[PDB]
Design a protein around this motif. Structure first.
Motif, PDB file in Angstrom:
ATOM      1  N   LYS A   1     -28.580 -40.653  56.963  1.00 34.66           N
ATOM      2  CA  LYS A   1     -29.011 -40.802  58.342  1.00 34.66           C
ATOM      3  C   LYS A   1     -30.452 -40.277  58.526  1.00 34.66           C
ATOM      4  CE  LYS A   1     -25.834 -38.530  60.474  1.00 34.66           C
ATOM      5  NZ  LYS A   1     -25.323 -37.825  59.250  1.00 34.66           N
TER       6      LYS A   1
ATOM      7  N   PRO B   1     -29.667 -41.954  64.525  1.00 38.53           N
ATOM      8  CA  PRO B   1     -28.306 -41.661  64.985  1.00 38.53           C
ATOM      9  C   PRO B   1     -27.237 -42.414  64.185  1.00 38.53           C
ATOM     10  CG  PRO B   1     -29.320 -43.211  66.455  1.00 38.53           C
ATOM     11  CD  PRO B   1     -30.430 -42.693  65.548  1.00 38.53           C
ATOM     12  N   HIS B   2     -27.652 -43.141  63.151  1.00 35.69           N
ATOM     13  CA  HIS B   2     -26.721 -43.925  62.326  1.00 35.69           C
ATOM     14  C   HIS B   2     -27.224 -44.021  60.872  1.00 35.69           C
ATOM     15  CE1 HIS B   2     -29.795 -47.019  62.515  1.00 35.69           C
ATOM     16  NE2 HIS B   2     -29.872 -46.760  63.809  1.00 35.69           N
ATOM     17  N   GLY B   3     -26.493 -44.729  60.015  1.00 36.84           N
ATOM     18  CA  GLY B   3     -26.920 -44.867  58.631  1.00 36.84           C
ATOM     19  C   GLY B   3     -28.166 -45.732  58.493  1.00 36.84           C
TER      20      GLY B   3
ATOM     21  N   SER C   1     -30.196 -48.604  56.488  1.00 36.29           N
ATOM     22  CA  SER C   1     -30.057 -49.688  55.533  1.00 36.29           C
ATOM     23  C   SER C   1     -31.377 -49.711  54.742  1.00 36.29           C
ATOM     24  CB  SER C   1     -29.855 -51.019  56.260  1.00 36.29           C
ATOM     25  OG  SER C   1     -30.984 -51.319  57.069  1.00 36.29           O
TER      26      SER C   1
ATOM     27  N   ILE D   1     -23.587 -39.877  55.743  1.00 37.80           N
ATOM     28  CA  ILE D   1     -22.461 -40.064  56.642  1.00 37.80           C
ATOM     29  C   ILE D   1     -21.177 -39.667  55.908  1.00 37.80           C
ATOM     30  CG2 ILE D   1     -20.990 -41.818  57.719  1.00 37.80           C
ATOM     31  CD1 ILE D   1     -23.677 -43.254  58.482  1.00 37.80           C
TER      32      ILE D   1
END
Ligand SMILES: Nc1nc2c(ncn2[C@H]2C[C@H](O)[C@@H](COP(=O)(O)O)O2)c(=O)[nH]1
Ligand SMILES: [Ca+2]
Ligand SMILES: [Ca+2]
Ligand SMILES: [Ca+2]
Length: 341
Positions: free
Chosen positions: A282, A303-305, A307, A341
């Motif tokens: 993250k 706020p997320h993984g 890519s 995560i």
DNA sequence: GGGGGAAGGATTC
DNA sequence: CACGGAATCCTTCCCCC
């Protein structure tokens, strides 16, 4: 509590020796070639045959070759050493489930249960030493004491291919006689700060006003050294969890040109993602080693993984932020992914 | 006052 | 002339109750 510390001898080079036994007895130097000019780079490690002449980790390959022009110089093969290491760790894992894999060549065992008293501990050490030498042909040094720190110190004093116990009597002797620079975690920076405070031995930390110690080397380091001097250090054995994966590369020429640094940065990103496994980070940090060997970085937590497309995109922005906020030319460039995560 | 992150840097091995 | 890669720690900043 009984802690048994295992440290593989001149590991990288010894592995090369295992993979090509005709190397035994000759000076072996494992190098990290940077590619800036012939023999540019540094020594990652060297066997003792090479070390007794001054060729050791950290010195430029060019310096090593001036001292030992006829030694065997080999490129570092991290992946190979890591697989060999993992095999050795599994083997120790059967000497206890209370294990701390500190690095590619260091592990601590809480053999508090598997044994009682220092006689059996020492016997167990030889069992481990012989087992590893037998199954992998790797010699290691074993350090045994009451806590992690003195177990490691024990190994530092016994290496190479040794074994040693520091019992509740010698611990006290070292606390006042062991040069404090030789305490794990105390590098050159900290060593000098402690010298300026009049601290040359662990025990001296008890004659200073704590708030002064904290002020000079930080609270964590302060409580650490104090606890050891009071003969009260007792951190538990437990393998930490990988909290970051990254890659940094050296450019042919120091640069400040974006379209010139990118291919390096992207290659760093590509290897980092391969290393990631199925781990999704993250946070991403772009790290740049400046021309005067100074390290600078800019990162961002999402706020997320992240890519790989996002990583490619964010890294360029972070790199621009570095070039924008730091004038120096850039020598090394890389990325680091964390907050999985 | 201070919990809780996040960011950039400092240090160590 | 000097590579790498990762963990702790530190200090600063910030949001906010
Ligand atoms: N690349 C690199 N690895 C090092 C250096 N010093 C120690 N190591 C590694 C060798 C392996 C492990 C052994 O402990 O630490 C160094 O200066 N550069
Ligand atoms: Ca070691
Ligand atoms: Ca070692
Ligand atoms: Ca030291």
């Amino acid at each position: 509590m009984i802690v048994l510390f295992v440290d593989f001898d001149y590991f990288y080079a010894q592995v090369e020796e295992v993979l090509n036994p005709s190397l035994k007895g000759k000076p072996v130097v494992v190098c990290v070639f940077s590619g800036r000019f012939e023999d540019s780079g540094a020594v990652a490690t060297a066997n003792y045959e090479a070390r007794k002449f001054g060729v050791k980790a950290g010195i430029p390959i060019v310096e090593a070759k001036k001292i030992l022009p006829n030694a065997v110089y080999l490129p570092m093969r991290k992946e190979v050493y890591q697989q060999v290491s993992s095999r050795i760790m599994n083997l120790l894992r059967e000497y206890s489930e209370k294990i701390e894999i500190a690095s590619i060549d260091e592990a601590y065992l809480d053999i508090s249960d598997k044994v009682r008293d220092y006689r059996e501990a020492y016997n167990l050490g030889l069992e481990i030493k012989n087992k590893i030498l037998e199954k992998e042909k790797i010699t290691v040094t074993v350090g045994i004491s009451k806590n992690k720190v003195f177990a490691k110190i024990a190994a530092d004093m016994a290496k190479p291919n040794g074994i040693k116990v520091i019992d509740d009597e010698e611990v006290k002797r070292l606390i006042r006689e062991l040069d404090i620079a030789d305490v794990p975690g105390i590098g050159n920076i900290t060593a000098e700060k402690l010298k300026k405070l009049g601290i040359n031995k662990l025990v001296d930390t008890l004659s200073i006003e704590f708030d002064k110690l904290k002020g000079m080397i930080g609270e964590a380091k302060a409580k650490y050294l104090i606890s050891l001097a009071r003969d009260e250090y007792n951190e538990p054995i437990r393998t930490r969890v990988r909290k970051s994966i990254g890659r940094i590369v050296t450019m042919k020429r120091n640069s400040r040109n974006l379209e010139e640094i990118k291919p390096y940065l992207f290659r760093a990103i590509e290897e980092s993602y391969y290393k990631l496994d199925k781990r999704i980070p993250k946070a991403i940090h772009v790290v740049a080693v400046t021309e005067d060997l100074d390290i600078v970085s800019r990162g961002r937590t999402f706020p997320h993984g992240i890519s790989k497309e996002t990583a490619y995109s964010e890294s360029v922005k972070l790199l621009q932020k570095i070039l924008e906020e730091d004038e120096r030319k850039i020598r090394r460039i890389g990325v680091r992914f964390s907050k999985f995560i």
